[PDB]
């Protein structure tokens, strides 16, 4: 009668905030909703990802899969991580909801993934689009040089270009990068007047930010556009009020202004998390658990992901974020994209929503 879920995440390491989160979110979605469905109990079986790491992902699925008997596998951060598991899911006959990875062809690797989180193309459009309405006419692309790093450059410069803005510079910084400040004298060299980044939300994206400030690039003038990624909240206070000003495109924002995320955000506190901790991957976590609720009343808690799949395409309801929906064609999660700045707000640092770019697809694989 339990129904266990594999939950694969950065639980430990420089990465734990964000498998923490998936914890968080899954926790806030039982405080509301129960662990009973379908007359099951259902249980989340928690592993610990690490780092970017195919193969140690690889054997976390199928130890969940054969030693726990789980009937769904979810969370994945990194990119090569979900990717590893990808070609198992369907033999095994077990769905994988995607809570983070965030490269477009993801969801063409089996047909049993759905992703509840984001794809870079999709944040990444609008980036190109403010990029242009905020009069940028030459960027400096710096992407850190792996799946999603790649989808970011590639749908920016096909974007902004087709605006008739100029891409000067493109940087892939490999993931292992510290030191940011020899990309900042190539940014300052290269004359642009902003910059386009992506890095995965961590360490890096911390240290970009702090080199992008410590070498005078945002008092020069030259604006930073990244994805949200960039920017998440936990970071916000170790960047301090220099990082006021800051644009980026995000999916969600612990600050949208919403009731649905308003509740969300006590469900949170009420499962034991903390406000400041509360990070993307939570609202991906919260939806990610809808998404096996359903399948698993769907399936009569019984183990059939074709049935199960079917019942999650075209679903459609508000989440946290805003009103969402999963496309069947790609599997992926249709949702609003947000331009945001970060700004401080009754004495905190927030990423204030500004517009609202509605029901964007995976603009990765929507024109294929
Ligand atoms: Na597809």
Redesign the pocket.
Known sequence: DTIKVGVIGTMSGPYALFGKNYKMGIDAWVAEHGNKVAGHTVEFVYRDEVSPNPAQSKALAQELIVKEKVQYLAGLYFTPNAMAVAPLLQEAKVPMVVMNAATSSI??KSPYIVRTSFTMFQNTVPAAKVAKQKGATKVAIAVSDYGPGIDAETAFKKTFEAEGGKVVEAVRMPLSTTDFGPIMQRIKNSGADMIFTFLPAGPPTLGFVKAYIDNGLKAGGVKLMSTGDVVTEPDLPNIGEAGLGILSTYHYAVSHDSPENKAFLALLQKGGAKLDEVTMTSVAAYDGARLIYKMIEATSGKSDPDKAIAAVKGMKWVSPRGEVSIDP???HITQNVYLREVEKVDGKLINRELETFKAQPDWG?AKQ
């Open positions: 969801t063409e064609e790609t599997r694989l």
